Design a protein around this nucleic acid. Structure first.
Length: 145
DNA sequence: TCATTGAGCAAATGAGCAACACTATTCGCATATAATGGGGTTAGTGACTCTTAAGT
């Protein structure tokens, strides 16, 4: 399943506020290590094109996201690539198509070990994004309420 | 009762379109002292034929 429409836009807006918060570099580096090794591949003098949230609410959003997404680094990397840096979904899917190993395909390759197409790459990064938001949402209500 | 044939079906993947937004290319236009007629061959062909033209 997935979320409803109002919950999707609410979580999307809160995550881009949180992404504009971490994009300045105001996250303390001892708190987590995956954002620490994500934010080292970007210049320190970044520009601010998005509205930025305040300190402790962004601290609350950062602590809940690395408490629920501390088991995997790939889906968390997609999340920081879409929301923190601000890259679009199509660029993420194009780079994942240009990198990923040959996989077994069903109902179109007949089991042939081949590279994934761009359409299934867009579909799997959309599924990864929707699954990460479904892991974010009820634990975020548990942190808020 | 079960293997075999006849028919179909949800799902995953590959292809692609439609409208829109940003951006790297490309083209039209403007330079206000005065500026005012060009290079570059082929040079020890031979023989024959067809047409044009001055000469008789």
């Amino acid at each position: 399943l997935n979320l409803t429409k109002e919950q999707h836009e609410w979580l999307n807006g809160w995550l881009e506020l949180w992404g504009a918060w971490v994009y300045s570099g105001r996250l303390e580096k001892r708190m987590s290590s995956v954002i620490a090794k994500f934010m080292e591949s970007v210049e320190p003098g970044r520009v601010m094109t998005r509205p930025m949230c305040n300190d402790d609410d962004g601290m609350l959003i950062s602590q809940v996201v690395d408490s629920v997404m501390y088991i995997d680094k790939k889906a968390f990397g997609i999340l920081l690539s879409y929301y923190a840096h601000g890259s679009s979904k199509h660029a993420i899917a194009s780079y994942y198509h240009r990198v990923a190993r040959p996989r077994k395909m069903l109902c179109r390759g007949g089991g042939r070990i081949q590279k994934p197409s761009l359409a299934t790459c867009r579909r799997e990064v959309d599924e990864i994004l929707n699954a990460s938001l479904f892991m974010i949402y009820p634990v975020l209500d548990s942190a808020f309420k």
